[PDB]
Design a protein around this ligand. Structure first.
Ligand SMILES: [Zn+2]
Lengths: 235, 7
């Protein structure tokens, strides 16, 4: 019955063996943000950036990488709330999909998808991206880039997200750093429209002060314990 | 809204 909007960050996929920029270093897989997550870095060294996400994409599909209990808990939450549930993620992994979630809004794109340089059309891509690859949507074909939103680019599905933010009875942010905007500002927006805000995190986010309710610790145990408590709450 | 940004 209550409308629930869930925002997830890199923290929820950390226990599954997927790492992304850390606090102390400010490095992603020992790379600078600016070199692997900007339009400029891609224009400077297309070969390196393409190879970077080639590594990330094939690491994602290793047998050792599995959705953890936090991913699974959110899947059960959708089963219970039906279409009164919306999952928005900053992650480019597919662990929400593997866990059983559907209609997940990837505001920062997906690692298992690529995009045509000029057409903007999106293609499913599981293998490596090579210089020998072009599009089949244009009469004059074009180079392929990862379908990932870089810093300086516009996030995806923003219209649908803000619409859901104003409708949500309960807003839950999971594994978010609070450093990446506009995603970190979502908790604000949710409160103006009267939503109850909850933060579930291993590391308390910088905007954690904001949230009405907080719980901290490993996601695979904090998230299921909150989801299970929310489910029994609605009987 | 705006574009993806840090800080
Ligand atoms: Zn094309």
């Amino acid at each position: 019955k209550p409308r629930v909007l869930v925002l997830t960050g890199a923290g929820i996929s950390a226990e599954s063996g997927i790492r992304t920029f850390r606090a102390a270093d400010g490095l992603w897989e020992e790379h600078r943000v600016e070199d692997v997550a900007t339009p400029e870095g891609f224009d400077r060294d297309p070969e390196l950036v393409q190879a970077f996400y080639n590594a990330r994409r094939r690491q994602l599909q290793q047998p050792e990488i599995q959705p953890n209990a936090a991913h699974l808990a959110l899947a059960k939450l959708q089963d219970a709330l039906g279409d009164r549930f919306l999952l928005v993620t900053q992650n480019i992994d597919n662990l929400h999909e593997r866990a059983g979630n559907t209609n997940v809004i990837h505001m920062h794109g997906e690692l298992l998808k690529v995009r045509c340089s000029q057409s903007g059309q999106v293609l499913d891509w599981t293998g490596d991206v090579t210089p020998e690859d072009k599009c089949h949507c244009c009469q004059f074909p074009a180079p392929l880039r990862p379908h990932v939103v870089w810093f300086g680019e516009m996030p995806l599905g923003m219209d649908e997200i803000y619409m859901a933010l104003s409708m949500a009875d309960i807003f839950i942010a999971i594994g978010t750093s609070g450093h990446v905007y506009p995603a970190a500002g979502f908790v604000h927006e949710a409160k103006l429209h009267g939503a109850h805000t909850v933060e579930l995190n291993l590391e308390p986010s910088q905007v954690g002060n904001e949230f009405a309710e907080k719980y901290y610790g490993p996601a695979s145990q904090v998230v299921p314990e909150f989801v299970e408590k929310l489910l029994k709450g609605l009987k | 809204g705006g574009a993806k940004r840090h800080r």
